[PDB]
Paper text:
In this study, we determined the crystal structure of the DndE protein from the haloalkaliphilic archaea Natronorubrum bangense JCM10635 at a resolution of 2.31 Å. Size-exclusion chromatography was used for DndE aggregation state analysis, which confirmed that DndE formed a monomer consisting of the five α-helices H1 (residues 12 to 25), H2 (residues 29 to 42), H3 (residues 61 to 65), H4 (residues 69 to 83), and H5 (residues 90 to 113); two β-sheets (β1 [residues 7 to 10] and β2 [residues 56 to 60]); and a long flexible linker (residues 43 to 55) between H2 and β2. Sequence alignment of DndE from bacterial E. coli B7A and archaeal N. bangense JCM10635 showed only 22% identity. However, the two DndE structures from E. coli B7A and N. bangense JCM10635 can be superimposed with a root mean square deviation of 2.138 Å over 75 Cα atoms. Unlike the tetrameric conformation of DndE from E. coli B7A, the archaeal DndE from N. bangense JCM10635 forms a monomer. The difference in the aggregation state of the archaeal DndE protein indicated Dnd protein interactions that were likely different from those in bacteria. The in vitro reaction showed that DndE was capable of nicking circular pUC19 plasmid DNA to nicked products, followed by generating linearized DNA fragments. Although the PT modification occurs at 5′-GPSATC-3′/5′-GPSATC-3′ in N. bangense JCM10635 (11), we did not detect sequence-selective nicking at the 5′-GATC-3′ site when the gel-purified DndE-nicked pUC19 DNA was subjected to runoff sequencing. Together with the result that DndE had similar nicking activity against PT- and non–PT-modified pUC19 plasmids, these results demonstrate that DndE introduced nicks onto DNA in a non–sequence-specific and PT-independent manner. Our results showed that DndE displayed a binding affinity of 48.4 ± 2.3 μM to intact dsDNA and showed a binding affinity of 18.8 ± 2.8 μM to nicked DNA (nDNA), which shares the same DNA sequence as dsDNA but has a nick between dG and dA within the 5′-GATC-3′/5′-GATC-3′ motif. In terms of the archaeal DndE, the preferential binding for nicked DNA is attributed to the R19- and K23-containing positively charged surface.
Author numbering: 3 to 116
Write the structure that this text describes.
Amino acid sequence: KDLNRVQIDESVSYKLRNLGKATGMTPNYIARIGLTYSLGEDRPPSMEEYDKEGKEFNRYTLLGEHDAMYIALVKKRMLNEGYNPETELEDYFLAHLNRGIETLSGRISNLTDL
C-alpha cells in the first residue's frame, strides 16, 4: 500500500555511488531519472534479477511532488503487462528502479576518467 521505504539491489547500489562520483549529483535525482528512463523502455524489466539488501529510498525524497503520477503510471503499465498492483507493486517498482540505474551505469561506468 504505502510503499514508504524500499531497497535497491546491493550491486546496483555500488553502480549508483559511481554515477554519483561521475556526475556530482544526489542519489535521489540520479535514481528518479533512471526510473523515468526505465518506465519509458518497451521491454518489461526482469522480476527475478534484484535483491533488496542495498540502499534504502523514501518515496517522498525519491519521486518528490510527482509521486502519485509515477505510482499511477507504474500501476497502468503493470495492468497492461499482466501483473497485479495489489500483490506486486513493490517488486515491479523496484524492477524499474534497479533497471534504470543499471542502464545509466552501463554507459557511464565506461568513462572511468569521470
